Write a protein that binds this ligand. Structure first.
Ligand SMILES: OC[C@H]1O[C@@](CO)(O[C@H]2O[C@H](CO)[C@@H](O)[C@H](O)[C@H]2O)[C@@H](O)[C@@H]1O
Ligand SMILES: OC[C@H]1O[C@@](CO)(O[C@H]2O[C@H](CO)[C@@H](O)[C@H](O)[C@H]2O)[C@@H](O)[C@@H]1O
Lengths: 272, 272
């Protein structure tokens, strides 16, 4: 029956600059006007992704679940739909299931990122994307590919690293990249964490941000510009996301239809 | 109850890496039947609110708190009411309770030493609000250090580590535009440091030549951006682990005098 618990299920493997607690606080700020408690339930990696979900349903430990790192064909989404556990996703699946969700428009972000580099005079653009299994990788990759076409620029190919690749190695990669004779003039990053490491490596090779190369990056809080005011920054509002995920879940638990409980936040360029 | 309540002020720093603390806790709780509820509160005027509410409701078997004052009402209240708890920080009021803390005194002392070693003569420090015990630890270590290393303090009282970053930056710029400048800085916050450096740089000041900076950080981040910052690591994930172990043992009867630890300043490998 009523547990008055919202389970937040988070992978322990997150980024340096995930500002995860801002997400936690957005959820909890909404839940404070209610009788709901927020339980944080970690899982370590991919091999145990379904473990906490099965465990919530087996013990009946939560009235609703928040999940993230959504795949287009997500077994968690399907399992909780079938088992009638109210849930909301941070991200979007694409499997013909209408569920509550909130996501950032990574497609629009990568498209507008290419445009901006093109406006900066840039002609050869690389992008650093998530692992391909997550839906937001396909959103980003799509927005970027569409952008390289619409803005009459070309892609500098990049397969080496990803958004989840070790920072020390992003840094080394960035250093060797700007010591190559073949190098790009623009970078789209889908992680503020990857961007930090990338810039460190760039500077280590005599490269000046804004001069020799332009960078567009997302960030989940306002940090990159104290650090490097020349980075073209886009804010992803992680606290807002936490608020919206909570809003949606509460309404789903009370029987509002999932179709009305869906939002997508748009990229906003940092005032910084 | 099977619930550990993590009581957290929503007012945290940008670079708090709070989730790293959360994950240290859950990593330990995973071998147990305990669930971690995250319980926020907004400010100081409601600090005791979640504490009274946990005990009125009986909604937890143990509590984790932080932002510890030397004469902390929460600590006294929970001691009196026999609610197992552990503090991230230390009180100083004749009550022996489980705790884990970081040695802020030793950090500020070793900070001043390092700056002295770099040939610096006039050292400023940015400390927390006076009400919290770690402020007194830091201010003490700094005070001893200025004496022991034959240098002088540059007086500062305009800001704290809880003062807004934009205002820290503006303060850092005007500070270097003055004819009275410190040549060394001790920071008790990775967040303030970031804003601080941005302000210095906007005044044409170079980190490592014109001024040296020692800063704590709760994860390895300061050196990617600014390699010349003398970084000390506070291990927040270890903190989370220790808080959890201590609380578990305290819940099962262990004497509090035996559940106390302080981690020491560790100089970051990415530091000069
Ligand atoms: O858990 C991933 C989840 O979030 C989104 C939103 O863009 O992808 C993000 O992953 C992290 C979640 O906070 C952040 O670093 C940033 O929001 C973004 O990379 C979803 O698309 C995805 O399901
Ligand atoms: O939460 C306050 C609590 O932590 C200590 C540990 O040094 O002070 C810290 O406050 C935050 C804890 O994560 C961080 O900003 C930073 O690690 C430090 O300033 C305790 O002394 C205090 O009670």
């Amino acid at each position: 029956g009523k547990t008055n618990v919202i389970a937040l299920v988070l992978s322990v493997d997150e980024e340096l600059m995930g500002f995860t607690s801002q997400m936690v606080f957005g959820i909890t700020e909404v839940l404070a006007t209610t009788q709901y408690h927020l339980v944080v339930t970690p899982h370590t990696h991919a091999k145990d992704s379904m473990v906490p979900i099965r465990y919530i349903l087996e013990t009946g430990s939560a009235d609703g679940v928040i999940i993230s790192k959504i795949e287009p064909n997500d077994p968690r989404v399907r399992f909780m739909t079938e088992r009638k556990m109210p849930f909301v996703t941070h991200g979007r699946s694409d499997m013909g299931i209408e569920h509550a969700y909130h996501d950032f428009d990574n497609e629009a972000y990568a498209y507008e990122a290419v445009e901006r580099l093109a406006q900066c005079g840039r002609k050869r653009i690389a992008i650093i994307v998530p692992p391909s299994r997550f839906a937001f990788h396909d959103h980003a990759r799509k927005g970027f590919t569409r952008g390289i076409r619409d803005f009459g620029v070309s892609e500098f190919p990049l397969d080496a690293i990803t958004i989840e690749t070790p920072l020390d190695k992003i840094r080394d990669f960035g250093k060797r990249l700007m010591q190559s004779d073949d190098r790009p003039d623009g970078i789209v990053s889908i992680s503020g964490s990857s961007t930090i490491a990338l810039v460190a490596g760039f500077e280590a090779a005599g490269v000046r941000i804004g001069k020799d190369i332009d960078i567009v990056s997302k960030q989940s809080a306002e940090f990159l510009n104290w650090i490097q005011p020349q980075i073209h920054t886009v804010n992803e509002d992680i606290k807002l996301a936490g608020r919206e995920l909570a809003k949606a879940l509460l309404a789903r638990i009370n029987g509002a239809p999932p179709e009305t409980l869906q939002s997508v936040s748009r990229p906003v360029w940092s005032s910084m």
